[PDB]
Amino acid sequence: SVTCPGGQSTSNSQCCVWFDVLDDLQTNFYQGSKCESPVRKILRIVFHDAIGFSPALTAAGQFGGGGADGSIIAHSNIELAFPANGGLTDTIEALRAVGINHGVSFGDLIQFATAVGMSNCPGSPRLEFLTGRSNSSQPSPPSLIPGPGNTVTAILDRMGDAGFSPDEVVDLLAAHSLASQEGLNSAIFRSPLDSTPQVFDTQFYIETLLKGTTQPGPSLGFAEELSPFPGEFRMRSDALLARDSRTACRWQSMTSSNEVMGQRYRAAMAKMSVLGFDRNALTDCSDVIPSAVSNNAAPVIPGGLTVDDIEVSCPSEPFPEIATASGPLPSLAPAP
Ligand code: HEM
Ligand SMILES: *[C@@H]1O[C@H](CO)[C@@H](O[C@@H]2O[C@H](CO)[C@@H](O)[C@H](O)[C@H]2NC(C)=O)[C@H](O)[C@H]1NC(C)=O
Ligand SMILES: O=C(NO)c1ccccc1
Ligand SMILES: [Ca+2]
Ligand SMILES: [Ca+2]
Numbered sequence: 001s002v003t004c005p006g007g008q009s010t011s012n013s014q015c016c017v018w019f020d021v022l023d024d025l026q027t028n029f030y031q032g033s034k035c036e037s038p039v040r041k042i043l044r045i046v047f048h049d050a051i052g053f054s055p056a057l058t059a060a061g062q063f064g065g066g067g068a069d070g071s072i073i074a075h076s077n078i079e080l081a082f083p084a085n086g087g088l089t090d091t092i093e094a095l096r097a098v099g100i101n102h103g104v105s106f107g108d109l110i111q112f113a114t115a116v117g118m119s120n121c122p123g124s125p126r127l128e129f130l131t132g133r134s135n136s137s138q139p140s141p142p143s144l145i146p147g148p149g150n151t152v153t154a155i156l157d158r159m160g161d162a163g164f165s166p167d168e169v170v171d172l173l174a175a176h177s178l179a180s181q182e183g184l185n186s187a188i189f190r191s192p193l194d195s196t197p198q199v200f201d202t203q204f205y206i207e208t209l210l211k212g213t214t215q216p217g218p219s220l221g222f223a224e225e226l227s228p229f230p231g232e233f234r235m236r237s238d239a240l241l242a243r244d245s246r247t248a249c250r251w252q253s254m255t256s257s258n259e260v261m262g263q264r265y266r267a268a269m270a271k272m273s274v275l276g277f278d279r280n281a282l283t284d285c286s287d288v289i290p291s292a293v294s295n296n297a298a299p300v301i302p303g304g305l306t307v308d309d310i311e312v313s314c315p316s317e318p319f320p321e322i323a324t325a326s327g328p329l330p331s332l333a334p335a336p
Pocket of ligand 1: 037039040041043044047087146147148155172173175176178179180181182183184235237335
């Protein structure tokens with residue numbers, strides 16, 4: 001086969017350097033293959049790098065962004081000044097050093113680190129990994145990243161211009177199952193968006209549908225909504241997307257099966273990874289990506305709440321039978 005210097009077998013010669021950056025990222029960036037803040041920050045970075053792509057700007061004669069081109073690292077001096085890119089500098093610098101030291105393009109490195117980071121989180125699918133994106137990039141145009149205070153129409157139009165259907169926008173948001181916020185309400189730093197910030201599961205879709213009952217911090221932050229229990233943060237765009245008629249039925253369908261959720265998320269991420277590129281010009285090195293440990297827990301409505309506490313918003317499909325839990329209402333600790 002093509003046997004890499006380390007004895008691993010792979011598809012193509014070009015995949016062998018990625019076994020060295022795999023070891024470096026797992027030992028150093030991810031602190032011993034952990035699923036903590038570095039993974040959550042890299043997931044926010046892959047979205048902010050790739051979504052700087054706009055066919056509408058190109059059509060009007062303007063540069064519309066190179067997509068998944070690593071421009072957020074090569075042109076960090078301009079892209080990290082954008083409102084949406086706060087809290088990312090330290091992760092960007094860490095990634096810059098790995099890219100330089102290994103001689104790989106910045107666009108490829110961000111896609112690789114997302115696939116490897118997710119493999120550290122129980123329940124994750126194995127994401128596709130393609131190599132060969134040119135290292136040359138121009139700065140992304142401003143105002144192409146969706147914000148938590150935007151209306152559902154605004155988010156759907158931005159995402160549609162980039163190439164995503166309403167269903168794929170709901171599918172991409174499965175990444176909020178491994179998420180917290182740091183900059184919307186700094187008083188409750190790293191408050192999780194679902195009760196399992198370290199497990200890639202369906203809890204995010206279930207819990208954003210529950211009635212907002214609780215104010216988790218001393219005041220409300222930017223685009224903050226009432227949440228279902230102490231310690232969980234709910235942002236306005238997630239609350240609105242769960243309830244809007246254009247996205248509500250896809251959101252409800254994501255609540256009962258981790259297997260369907262993983263499959264849909266893997267497909268939407270593969271599409272996002274080549275925005276600005278032709279995937280037929282890239283080399284497939286997906287065999288370098290290791291498997292995640294499986295998640296054996298079933299979907300649940302936490303802490304004694306029942307289906308009467310969820311605000312069913314898909315008028316055509318009845319809400320799935322999800323297991324209920326006993327005990328009092330949970331209070332979530334900060335995400336690690
Ligand atoms: C409709 C578009 C989306 C909006 C409006 C949005 C907005 C946000 C906001 C405001 C935060 C909190 C940032 C902070 O204050 O620390 C957040 C966190 C996060 N988002 Fe999104 N997001 C969206 C889509 C996505 C997508 C598509 C992905 C990736 C596939 C993603 C991955 C993450 C992750 C993993 C975090 C957690 C970061 C951490 O814990 O440090 N988001 N998002
Ligand atoms: C990809 O392009 C960037 C430049 O945009 C290169 O990054 C520079 O690399 C040099 C030498 O390795 C460093 O001293 C600079 O500080 C880097 N600049 C930035 C903005 O990071 C990078 O080397 C290129 N990588 C490859 C494989 O060609
Ligand atoms: O992460 C964001 N969008 O993905 C974001 C965060 C803060 C403000 C605006 C946008
Ligand atoms: Ca980019
Ligand atoms: Ca989760």
